[PDB]
């Protein structure tokens, strides 16, 4: 999924916030991995996305 820079800090067990309450919630016993990378070149345009 695409997210607003700062938000990345929410995608983690026990975190709160809009994304971590109404959009995507992680269980406290989660195991796995998370990859996150900026995509200002593609997902953002000066013409408005």
């Amino acid at each position, epitope marked *: 999924f695409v997210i607003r*820079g*700062d938000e*990345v*800090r929410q995608i983690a067990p026990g975190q709160t916030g809009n994304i971590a309450d109404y959009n995507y919630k992680l269980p406290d016993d989660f195991t796995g991995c998370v990859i996150a990378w*900026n995509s*200002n070149k593609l997902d953002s345009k000066v013409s408005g996305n």
Partner: nanobody
Amino acid sequence: SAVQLQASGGGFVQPGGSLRLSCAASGWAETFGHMGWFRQAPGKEREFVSAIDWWDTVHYYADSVKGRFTISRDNSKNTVYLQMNSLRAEDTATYYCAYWDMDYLQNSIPVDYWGQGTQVTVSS
């Protein structure tokens, strides 16, 4: 984690002037943490100068360089920049950009990685 820091800038300057330093980071780390600069005077100990969060929200500066040094971040190059002025003789030293890999900064004692020394010299 595997993070490489590339430093750029430094040279010989006149007192009270301005110069150019910038540090870029590459690789992959645990999280988006803080980034700062460390000063080493010849014959002295290595002390921190400042520390900026990744998202440019909160800034931390040393009491000895407050109001004289500032640090900002790029918007399309992922390279931290810093500006300075009114340089004095004590500023002749070796500077290193360092990456702190935690979300919230508490103190400057634990340092993760270090960059190549950039020697800056000021005199008449």
